[PDB]
Structure 1
């Protein structure tokens, strides 16, 4: 229908523990939420930008700005709107993928609710539940790490992903392997921390049988990744580099990636994410669902996406309580190492308005 307006909210949520990555430590999660309003009713979008431009060039205040002043006005000016039409209507604006994706999610959730159709149904789900791995930060000490991993294993997460960076790579892997053995599904994630000159150091990870090293080098260095793959045994996985289905196709032709992490906001929305799934499937490349420490709306959408057929490695969509004591929707609870795929219309979750209000820091209408 014609979109009436969009309500944009700043939202802040404490983390159960600080989460430390190669680019820093956050203790809180700030995020934007969008609520699209149509004659038909309503839809929810979550943006995955972080507070400052440390993971990619996009950040909360920048997403909000491009949202208020470009993206939202362009959709409000359109005659008939459809999730699929969002992309062409926003095409003239370069980049701003996470902001575009957030807004596409909200249009999609509104549309789908109006057709009593789930996200899972629209995306092409073949599974009622998905297996879930867990992502683990850099720690101050090896023993703090072992106890943390140990804990996650006990609750039955199927795979352990370790954040790494120079000075924290080989040792923490060695120690996790000595304590928990060669059978645990183990992978590493640099968030762009190394260079091609670090190859011999990343080769010292060969003896530990990791599933993948995720984004060892910078976002723009795709040829460098192909070069690095000729020198290390650990399969390369790309995250920040995979900004679109075309980018996935390019990386695969160039021998720069054997496994692709998918994050919907990173590629510009759930529709593009599906295309990425499909392009990868066609080239025989396994995909998995990435996590941006989303609240329950984004987690719901990701759980759905993650049940597509080519998702053949456990994703990062951990249960609500891996990050939050109190989520803003009905929480996701781990159950035999798995999470259930949401069932109702659209996302199949909405925010509980008392909980959302506690953690809303600002609210603006754009109409």
Structure 2
């Protein structure tokens, strides 16, 4: 039945990397259970527009007062109770995603299962930064191929793109290879990006501006390598517009950027209706976010590998009791209700910068 949101905690952690990362968490309490979600907004707006200070002020001053004490039928009803406000999708996603976890836990049912997924494991890829030269790129690719990753992504930039890609594909004729172009190109670079075409990249990720679709559509007329959109798809209607315009043929789907699981499933279904795949993007999540990501990724149109690689690659020690470790390019879905993971409250306390509790 229906669920009442009785209380909420905001906990900001400073989690040591394997030098630190600020992890904002929301915990929603109701019906004897709790839901947890992780904010992916940063202190300054670098990947996208939101910030921790804007987001938390929005939570504590607006979203939380709107839902505390109220009774809801499902997470969609929780989101609807916030809906006047414009943008701020990552802030919204904190509430929406904690709601999904809480709801799922009142039912005793895994999150992915309620979203309609039925994979027990999800394929994972790996992201490589810019290396000093070709052979150094190939060596690191060769390592990750031997570890069993199912997709290799190379970071590229003007002056360093065809070379790493050429050297890599020469050494690995059949692997799934992609590049992250990190909005560093313009339409003048069309001829240079077109030189990648002979290397059969599965896609080039967001080569032009972060909030553009229109110029992406033009670039896609000039090269044959498929484009993948990231920051410019923040909703199902964006997804529709991107695919119908021919802005790309693949979507990097990040649950929090689009406002949470319900809207993420909509992006996923829109893309599928165009027969375009999505894959799960990553944002250096602690185990809370990683676990939400893994559950979302069990949906059937996540047909390319996702950035939900091992937590040990990022954190000396994670915020959850359960280890999220990929083996042979496969990450298992964590067992249990909701996300299937559990905050380690004592460890969390040792790295808590700040916390607060709100009631009705």
Q: Shorter-normalised TM-score: what interval? A: over 0.9
- CA shift digits 1:87-127 (9 cap, x unpaired): 21111110010111111111111111111011111111121
Alpha-carbon contact 2:5-2:71 (below 8 Å) kept: no
Find the aligned partners of 2:315 and 2:138 in 1 and give their Cα distance: 21
Equivalent residue, structure 1, for 2:128: 136
Whole-Å separation in 2 of the counterparts to 1:5 and 1:190: 42
Aligned partner of residue 91 in structure 1, secondary structure: coil
Distance in structure 1 (CA, Å) of the matches to 2:82 and 2:160: 41
Task: Tell me, yes or no, if the aligned pair for 2:184 and 2:207 is still in contact at 8 Å.
Answer: yes
Of 196, 200, 203 in structure 2, the residue corresponding to residue 205 of structure 1 is 196
Once the two structures are TM-superposed, the CA of residue 141 in structure 1 deviates from its matched residue by 4.7
Q: In structure 2, what is the Cα distance between the partners aligned to 1:135 and 1:73? A: 40
The answer to whether structure 1 residue 153 and structure 2 residue 155 are counterparts is no
Aligned to 1:20: none
Task: Name the counterpart of 1:66.
Answer: 58
Paired residues in the alignment total 356
Residues 291 and 316, structure 1, Cα contact 8 Å, conserved in 2: yes
Structure 1 distance, partners of 2:282, 2:197, is 26
- 3-state SS, counterpart of residue 204 of structure 1: helix
How far apart in 1 are the matches of 2:132 and 2:22?
Answer: 24
What is residue 24 of structure 1 aligned with on the other side? none
Q: Distance in 2 between matches of 1:286 and 1:80?
A: 33
Q: Using the alignment, how far apart are the partners of 1:72 and 1:120 within structure 2?
A: 25
- Rounded Cα–Cα distance in structure 2 between residues aligned with 1:364 and 1:144: 47
Instruction: Tell me the residue number matched to 1:267.
Output: 258
| Structure 1: unaligned runs, 5 residues or longer | 17-26
The match for 1:22 is none
Equivalent residue for 1:116?
Answer: 108
- Which residue number corresponds to residue 209 of structure 2? 218
Report matched runs for 1:155-234 at 5 Å.
155-178=147-170, 180-234=171-225
| Superposition deviation, residue 143 in structure 1 | 5.1
Is structure 2 residue 82 aligned with structure 1 residue 90?
Answer: yes
| TM-score of the pair, normalised by structure 1 | 0.92
Q: Per-residue CA shift, 1:166-210, capped at 9, x if unaligned? A: 2332222223233x3211211011232222222122112122211
- Alignment of 1:328 with 2:330, yes or no, is no
1:127 matched residue in structure 2:
119
Find the aligned partners of 2:20 and 2:131 in 1 and give their Cα distance: 17
Q: Provide the residue aligned with 2:12 in structure 1.
A: 10
**2:274 is the alignment partner of 1:283:** yes
Q: Which residue of 2 aligns with 1:49?
A: 41
- Candidates 82, 87, 91, aligned match of 1:99: 91
1:252 alignment partner in structure 2: 243
Whether the 8 Å CA contact 2:72–2:78 is kept in 1: the answer is no
Matched-pair contact (CA < 8 Å) for 2:324–2:334: no
- Using structure 2 for the length normalisation, give the TM-score: 0.93
Of 32-41 and 309-318, deviating more is 32-41
Cα shift readout 1:15-48 (whole Å, capped 9, x = no counterpart): 33xxxxxxxxxx4322211111124321101111
Match of 1:23 in 2: none
Unaligned regions of 5+ residues in structure 2, if any? none
> Matched residues in 2 for 1:72 and 1:140: separation?
48
Using the TM superposition, give the Cα deviation of residue 77 of structure 1 relative to its aligned residue in structure 2, in angstroms.
Answer: 6.0
